[PDB]
Design a protein around this ligand. Structure first.
Ligand SMILES: *[C@@H]1O[C@H](CO)[C@@H](O)[C@H](O)[C@H]1NC(C)=O
Ligand SMILES: *[C@@H]1O[C@H](CO)[C@@H](O)[C@H](O)[C@H]1NC(C)=O
Ligand SMILES: *[C@@H]1O[C@H](CO)[C@@H](O)[C@H](O)[C@H]1NC(C)=O
Ligand SMILES: *P(=O)(O)Oc1ccccc1C
Ligand SMILES: *P(=O)(O)Oc1ccccc1C
Lengths: 542, 539
């Protein structure tokens, strides 16, 4: 005896025992740190994941595993806003492990599965973080939730395209591997391989999109949720040549020609593979082209392999009838990245800024924009009746960053997926958390709908308001509804009023906030026509 | 009759007594201000009228300057009203003076009118320019002159003795020096002179403002739906020469293409029938266009020392009072002149592709990219195909480009240079309007009201319309005397605030009482004035 049959599971690779957690409502079963891949260390660094070699004995799934090696953000030390995101377990090169939450006892019927891919800009993050805790969706919505670690940073994305040694997108491959893993083993946990919804946020949402666009990933999941990020758009992909440039430059920086050499690839990677992980982490930021924000050093490369063409091309020409996606943004996307190096912007004060500061800002936030590309931006975003207004200027600059990296690319992906015949639902998330740390001017900043999606307000010890608790429940029901049926709507019910599909014609999306749903038509339409349609033609012939 | 006979350093004049609703008026019509620029004097700066003996007949309107007669909508009051109401002749230079009956108490302020019509047409002889209501009602001495138009006024071979260019403007200026010498005898004040004009006329007003010798001939100025700056009001010396050369080439000149001296080319041009010049006049335009007329003022380095842009940018405006403004829908009137899909008959709902090409037409100097910019700007992207919007938006494109944004730019530039400026937007559509309603308050229809035409009972205006008319005449004349549109005492109005670069206050002229808005355009005018030029270069 002594073995709870609910916590014992035999998956393809061996036996693991999980742990019983107390969620507020009931208990839940958590299986944590299940290795989905042989550790990519030593000679396996920069390389696609080999799948986990099988193990005898019973593996211990009772606890979270190491976080993939990453930059730990030092901006505002000891500050909840920045540090919620920072690694909560020990950094290792051996990070590829996944987590599964299910109801207790393990579900009778094959419940649909939600796979969560985290964000953090492909330089950072981990499934261990408190906001991604699957316990509440498991308990309340009776769902089965998976989250995998993927290599971030140089280890995940450093690429010397066309080489066997550092092929690129190995992080995205980690993700896909874990997707396969869900296919092979999830039913053992009470999951339903026939229904799999990928959902992610920021870089993570971009990852989701990338799996939509890559054929080998399409066979593993049936539905997608992109929250505040897209595969198209300025920040999420790089030219193969750019990636190569950045790689050989970082190589130079860590003293790995060695000595002024560096023509032979295999030789260069093989040298890079000797330097201690933390040195690579210390240097990954120096390779960037410009003084910029919302631009990351090592990201998915367009290799003609994982991404066969650019996501632009791909979403333009694809066939999406198989597919239903739920996509949306939060109310102020820009404000977070502002304190990250547009001058004038702090969390510690109201951040009113001069005009010169606004202009300078526009150069920083739209870094690849020439003059007149940028003068176009300024013309569009200035209030010309009151061009010097510091409040307006501030709010403007926020909106510029937000619109350029998030809202207009989300709008473009929605429009195209719809036109390509997919069921698309769209949302703007407008509720500011009562628990929120960052100052008032930053609004409902990037990433702060997450904790409401995972139903953290359902935890009483966390100091949310009862209205937020109800709200959080309502979101959970939307998401697990989409997961289950491909529609966010409450199926039996007709009310509040129901949430309509985003279409190319009507373009309806809804507002997610404390009030019930209202339907808004067109999503930053004129502005996105500028960003998506006009501005490309501009800096393109500048 | 005592008043009907007046002296005028050129010699004796006999006026005529006329009936305004509220009094009599002494009307003197067809006073020659220059010896007729016919024959060898065609294309040449006007020489002043040589004096005469005898009592000259001022009792009727003289000839209209030789011009294209609009054939578009036969017998339609709307287009017809701008056509010549007198006979066409190259001997057209005669002005018109209105005094009340009797002659003055003290010297009264003077209002000089310069007509619109695109430099390709016009006359003071026109109906809506009826000068008497302002005279009788507001006690104003009101002058209106004919200046040369079309090739005769503006054809230039810049640098040439015999076709210097801007001679139509010189006709205006000379009319002004005649008013500076001779208006006194009509009981007008030579030290109060307020030039007001509409459209091309407005452009001429600003044109005098910018021209140095013109400066001493006036005091205040009203610009109605036109500016000296902008897309349509001037050409380069280069393009002037280009067009003159081509038009010559379309009629005989120079004979069989011997090339060479401009003197012989102009000499040859002088011997063609006036109607021939008019016939081939419309062929010399570079592209297909809506605004954009063939022969206009030219920046010669003489009448304008630099381009109007440069002059309103560096100009010192210290003592200047200007009343500028636009009507509600400017562009509408023009669209039926050859943007496809626009008639006065059908209500002109258009396709998207129609709009797309219409943009190419009304902003002809735009490259593909500048066009893409204009479309992106004026398209409602939530409903890109909606015909009603596409139509109204095309009217807005043509209007904003050719009039509104120019007007705003001049306003702000004049304010920044220390001029007192009053801006107005005219919201009221006359009931007597023969044009379809989709054209709103079309270009040039605020003239009926400024000239006090609703005070004429037999014209069928509404009553609030004539109280409106009286309002407007009070406005304009108050500006004439003061250099300020308001009442000296009465408050009311509510006060019409000076347009400044900061506040940007402009007023609404409506039947309902005075309203103050801020930011005439701005967004949309920063496009046109700041950005689009940067984009017209590099593309
Ligand atoms: C690349 O050059 C190295 C020597 O630096 C050599 O050992 C290796 O075999 C070469 N491989 C290729 C790609 O030719
Ligand atoms: C041009 O030709 C005519 C011939 O009548 C002459 O009077 C004139 O002076 C000539 N010379 C030039 C180049 O002006
Ligand atoms: C509206 O009328 C005009 C003139 O008759 C014509 O150019 C236009 O095509 C008409 N609109 C349509 C498409 O019915
Ligand atoms: P994106 O990948 O930019 O999302 C981020 C980035 C940094 C910190 C938190 C989050 C959600
Ligand atoms: P502008 O000179 O364009 O003014 C016009 C033009 C044609 C007809 C009437 C008017 C007032």
């Amino acid at each position: 005896g002594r073995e709870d049959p609910q916590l014992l599971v035999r998956v393809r690779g061996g036996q693991l025992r999980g742990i019983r957690l107390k969620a507020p409502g009931g208990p839940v079963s958590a299986f944590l740190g299940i290795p989905f891949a042989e550790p990519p260390v030593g000679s396996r660094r920069f390389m696609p994941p080999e799948p986990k070699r099988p193990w005898s004995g019973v593996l211990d799934a009772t606890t979270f595993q190491n976080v993939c090696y990453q930059y730990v953000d030092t901006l505002y030390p000891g500050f909840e806003g920045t540090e919620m995101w920072n690694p909560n377990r020990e950094l290792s090169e051996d990070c590829l492990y996944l987590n599964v939450w299910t109801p207790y006892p393990r579900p009778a019927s094959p419940t649909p599965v939600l796979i969560w891919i985290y964000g953090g800009g492909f330089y950072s993050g981990a499934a261990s973080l408190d906001v991604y805790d699957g316990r509440f969706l498991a308990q309340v919505e009776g769902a089965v939730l998976v989250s995998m670690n993927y290599r971030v940073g140089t280890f995940g994305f450093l690429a010397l395209p066309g080489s066997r040694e550092a092929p690129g997108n190995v992080g995205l491959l980690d993700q896909r591997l874990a997707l396969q893993w869900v296919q092979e083993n999830i039913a053992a946990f009470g999951g339903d391989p026939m229904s799999v919804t990928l959902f992610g946020e920021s870089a993570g949402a971009a990852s989701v999109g990338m799996h939509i666009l890559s054929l080998p990933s399409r066979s593993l999941f049936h539905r997608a949720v992109l929250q505040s990020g897209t595969p198209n758009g300025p920040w999420a992909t790089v030219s193969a040549g750019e990636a190569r440039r950045r790689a050989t430059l970082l190589a130079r920086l860590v003293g790995c020609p060695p000595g002024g050499a560096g023509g032979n690839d295999t030789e260069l990677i093989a040298c890079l593979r000797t330097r201690p992980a933390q040195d690579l982490v210390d240097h990954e930021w120096h390779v960037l082209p410009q003084e910029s924000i919302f631009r990351f050093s090592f990201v998915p490369v367009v290799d003609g392999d994982f991404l066969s063409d650019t996501p632009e091309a791909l979403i333009n020409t694809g066939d999406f009838q198989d597919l239903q996606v739920l996509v949306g943004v939060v109310k102020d996307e820009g404000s977070y990245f502002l304190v990250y190096g547009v001058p004038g912007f702090s969390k510690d004060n109201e951040s009113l800024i001069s005009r010169a500061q606004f202009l300078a800002g526009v150069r920083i936030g739209v870094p690849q924009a020439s003059d007149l590309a940028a003068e176009a931006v300024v013309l569009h975003y200035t209030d010309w009746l009151h061009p010097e207004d510091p409040t307006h200027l501030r709010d403007a600059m926020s909106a510029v960053v937000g619109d350029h990296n998030v809202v207009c690319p989300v709008a473009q992906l929605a429009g195209r997926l719809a036109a390509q015949g997919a069921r698309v639902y769209a949302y703007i998330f407008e509720h500011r958390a009562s628990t929120l740390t960052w100052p008032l001017w930053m609004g409902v900043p990037h990433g702060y709908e997450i904790e409401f999606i995972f139903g953290l307000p359902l935890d009483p010890s966390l100091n949310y308001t009862t209205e937020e608790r109800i709200f959080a429940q309502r979101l959970m029901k939307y998401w697990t509804n989409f997961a289950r049926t491909g529609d966010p709507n409450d199926p039996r019910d007709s009310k509040s009023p129901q949430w309509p599909p985003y279409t190319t014609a009507a373009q309806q999306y809804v507002s997610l906030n404390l009030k019930p749903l209202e339907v808004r038509r067109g999503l930053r339409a004129q502005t996105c026509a500028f960003w998506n349609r006009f501005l490309p033609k501009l800096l393109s012939a500048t």
